[PDB]
Design a protein around this ligand. Sequence first.
Ligand SMILES: *[C@@H]1O[C@H](CO)[C@@H](O[C@@H]2O[C@H](CO)[C@@H](O)[C@H](O)[C@H]2NC(C)=O)[C@H](O)[C@H]1NC(C)=O
Lengths: 48, 48
Amino acid sequence: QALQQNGSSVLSEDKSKRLNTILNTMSTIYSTGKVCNPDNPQECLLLE
Amino acid sequence: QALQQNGSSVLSEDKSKRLNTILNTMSTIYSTGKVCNPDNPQECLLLE
Ligand SMILES: *[C@@H]1O[C@H](CO)[C@@H](O[C@@H]2O[C@H](CO)[C@@H](O)[C@H](O)[C@H]2NC(C)=O)[C@H](O)[C@H]1NC(C)=O
């Protein structure tokens, strides 16, 4: 049973590629998104 | 005549520091300004 689950295999190739791309985009936006001061737009901070 | 030049010494002290702050802010804005497109806001380019 632990070896039986299909996972993402049953998903179509184009749909699988789309899902992987969307997950990577999500992770990249979360990791490298920054906001900026309203009175000094040349000073912008990451999250962590 | 070259040596007798007065320069900005004739200006008031508070106005002198105000002018120096303005010049420094101008230089910093020009040097560190950056822009980026709405397609991928996580890639912003300097000028040079
Ligand atoms: C994982 O996906 C494959 C699909 O290829 C499943 O295989 C099917 O199994 C059913 C049930 O016996 C058959 O009716 C189909 O003919 C099979 N399709 C094939 C071989 O292409 C497999 O069962 C899935 N694993 C699960 C649900 O645990």
